[PDB]
Design an enzyme around this catalytic site. Sequence first.
Site, PDB file in Angstrom:
ATOM      1  N   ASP A   9       0.886  -1.180   0.000  1.00 31.77           N
ATOM      2  CA  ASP A   9       0.000   0.000   0.000  1.00 31.77           C
ATOM      3  C   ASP A   9       0.918   1.223   0.000  1.00 31.77           C
ATOM      4  OD1 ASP A   9      -2.543  -0.991   2.507  1.00 31.77           O
ATOM      5  OD2 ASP A   9      -2.133  -1.757   0.481  1.00 31.77           O
TER       6      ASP A   9
ATOM      7  N   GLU B  33     -14.168  -0.995   5.174  1.00 33.34           N
ATOM      8  CA  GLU B  33     -14.487  -0.967   3.750  1.00 33.34           C
ATOM      9  C   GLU B  33     -15.912  -1.464   3.557  1.00 33.34           C
ATOM     10  OE1 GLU B  33      -9.845  -1.882   2.380  1.00 33.34           O
ATOM     11  OE2 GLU B  33     -11.244  -3.411   3.104  1.00 33.34           O
TER      12      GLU B  33
ATOM     13  N   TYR C  49      -9.257  -9.290  -1.844  1.00 30.94           N
ATOM     14  CA  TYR C  49     -10.194  -8.256  -2.280  1.00 30.94           C
ATOM     15  C   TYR C  49     -10.858  -8.718  -3.563  1.00 30.94           C
ATOM     16  CZ  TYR C  49      -8.626  -4.614   1.016  1.00 30.94           C
ATOM     17  OH  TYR C  49      -8.347  -3.844   2.138  1.00 30.94           O
TER      18      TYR C  49
HETATM   19  C1  LIG Z   1      -1.904   3.496   2.689  1.00 30.82           C
HETATM   20  C2  LIG Z   1      -3.366   3.275   2.661  1.00 30.82           C
HETATM   21  C3  LIG Z   1      -3.927   2.051   3.153  1.00 30.82           C
HETATM   22  C4  LIG Z   1      -5.334   1.872   3.112  1.00 30.82           C
HETATM   23  C5  LIG Z   1      -5.884   0.599   3.610  1.00 30.82           C
HETATM   24  N1  LIG Z   1      -5.548  -0.513   2.752  1.00 30.82           N
HETATM   25  C6  LIG Z   1      -5.662  -1.796   3.439  1.00 30.82           C
HETATM   26  C7  LIG Z   1      -5.320  -3.034   2.578  1.00 30.82           C
HETATM   27  S1  LIG Z   1      -5.017  -4.507   3.468  1.00 30.82           S
HETATM   28  O1  LIG Z   1      -6.201  -4.827   4.308  1.00 30.82           O
HETATM   29  O2  LIG Z   1      -3.898  -4.275   4.299  1.00 30.82           O
HETATM   30  O3  LIG Z   1      -4.689  -5.609   2.545  1.00 30.82           O
HETATM   31  C8  LIG Z   1      -6.170   2.860   2.573  1.00 30.82           C
HETATM   32  C9  LIG Z   1      -5.602   4.085   2.079  1.00 30.82           C
HETATM   33  C10 LIG Z   1      -4.193   4.264   2.140  1.00 30.82           C
HETATM   34  F1  LIG Z   1      -3.651   5.324   1.719  1.00 30.82           F
END
Ligand SMILES: Cc1cc(CNCCS(=O)(=O)O)ccc1F
Length: 658
Positions: A232, A503, A615
């Site tokens: 991310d 989410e 996802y």
């Molecule tokens: C760095 C960042 C992270 C998120 C959340 N994403 C989570 C994905 S997971 O559950 O870790 O696979 C949402 C926005 C953002 F900028």
Amino acid sequence: ISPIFQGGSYQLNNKSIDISSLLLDKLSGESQTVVMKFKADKPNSLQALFGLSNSKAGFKNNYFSIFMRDSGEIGVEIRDAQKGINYLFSRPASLWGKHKGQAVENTLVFVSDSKDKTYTMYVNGIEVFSETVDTFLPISNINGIDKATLGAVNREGKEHYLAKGSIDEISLFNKAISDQEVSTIPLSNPFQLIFQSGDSTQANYFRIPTLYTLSSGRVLSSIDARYGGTHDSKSKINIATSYSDDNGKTWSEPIFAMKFNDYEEQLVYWPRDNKLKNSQISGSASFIDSSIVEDKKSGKTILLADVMPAGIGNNNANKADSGFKEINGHYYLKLKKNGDNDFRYTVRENGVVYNETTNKPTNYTINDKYEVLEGGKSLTVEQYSVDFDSGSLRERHNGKQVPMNVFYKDSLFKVTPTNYIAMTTSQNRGESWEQFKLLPPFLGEKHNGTYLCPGQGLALKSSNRLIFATYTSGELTYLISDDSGQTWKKSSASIPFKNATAEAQMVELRDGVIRTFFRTTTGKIAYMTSRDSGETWSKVSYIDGIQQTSYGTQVSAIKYSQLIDGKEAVILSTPNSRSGRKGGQLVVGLVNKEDDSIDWKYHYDIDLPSYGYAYSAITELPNHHIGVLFEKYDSWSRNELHLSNVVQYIDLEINDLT
Ligand SMILES: Cc1cc(CNCCS(=O)(=O)O)ccc1F
């Protein structure tokens, strides 16, 4: 060339099959290719499909094997104790097990190339590893090899790694066949790729799929094109889109919906070893988590995504600063100039950069692309490229100038290091996208932005209302527009969670009635209901009969157009597992019209309970089939980072689910 050995219809029922007589004296030279079409819908925890071994006492570590795990991992071992070589190459999440309840024929191609000293594995038309070594070990040059075996490896006379499955076809060649020749080998894949390594995005990795069926019948998909491995943000990530005009059979070459150019679009093989896998592109701006909706009145497609300035992600985003200043009841983007310790500028009306300390406007303006102009002249920065040539990640200038953008590390004027939400639109159903605009803050000056829920927004069927769910600490924050997305308001819905990645995805059960399904930290998917088109929201309930992990996974959901068993139906897509992101299911729910409760009646297994599923995106295709685009791996696991071509697409019919 033709095979030196070819055989098939081998059943592997926890008993090895000896093919030594047929194969061993055919092997010659130092290069070989194995082509194997096989099924394993109930594999053992660890099993060998194929082995060449020294079966003699005292040589238990002299063997070549192709093995798999019940996680879907594929690999090889190439071992010779006298030579002091013990090679193990593998990749998680490389296999299919079942599709529509029938065992999948996987096509495996393993190339052992003495000239280039390289071992390469493909499964189902996807290269899962390519490993070059200093000291090459030809697979049949192992000291004292005397057995060729299917469904085990013979070590010291005993069967190790016993397999359950079948090998419908196996061929060996005394040649390292080319990548070209590999591409000509027929496949029996249950899936398609929409986005993939080497395509127009030049991203080697993808995450966060979306799907949405447009009124013309075109099906649109968006995705994170992730360049710096599957991490991310912080990273470099663009948002890419592709569409299908034939009910998902074929897909257009991707274009970008949202992109930054401070860093090059590079296809990089991100390191998977423990020392380096957490390497992260640390100086790039990025987008993350997209969502799509179609507006009936204007006919436009609208796409939102989170936006991060250079170096920024969830971990380090300035919470407690929206990045905007209120002056009069209006919100203006704040800027900090090179050398200032505070943010002394705002972007006022007509992109005019304005000094707050002296209430004086400047000769700088910000254009529509968030680029910096001085006296109307475009300022530039030098682009970065990344590499591991030194043994660690380097980010360095590459000689190319690109427009200076306020989201960049090298920009004269910089935005607040926090997360924003951007919006873009398309007037040609995804053939091109406009330059994005930032959405205003919804929870005040001193609150960082909410986080977009990836997937679909909701276009209410009976009105012009558009809703995108977002989340923040303690609530879902629905963004509502009745004017084709020109203006937005919030509707806040308290949830009994602090700091949840909540989410959320919505379905319209009937006119004006919205049920939202969302990820929690409780191990259960939650839901809430609005009966006034999103103005107000119920308390939170939980679904029984589906398990998620403590950390949760995004869930996608649609309202199906057709009755099932005489009832209105909703279909949910999610992993069903309390252990990891695996056990993917579509769950069909029938609505009880007496009270709008849902009976979750049918659970369809996407693939094995042990195979990865994270996802996902689901849509009802115009022909009433169901399209699913999903992460076919465990996107949480620290063992399955940085895999290529695991976001995959399948086509299902409702009779398959029930
Ligand atoms: C760095 C960042 C992270 C998120 C959340 N994403 C989570 C994905 S997971 O559950 O870790 O696979 C949402 C926005 C953002 F900028």
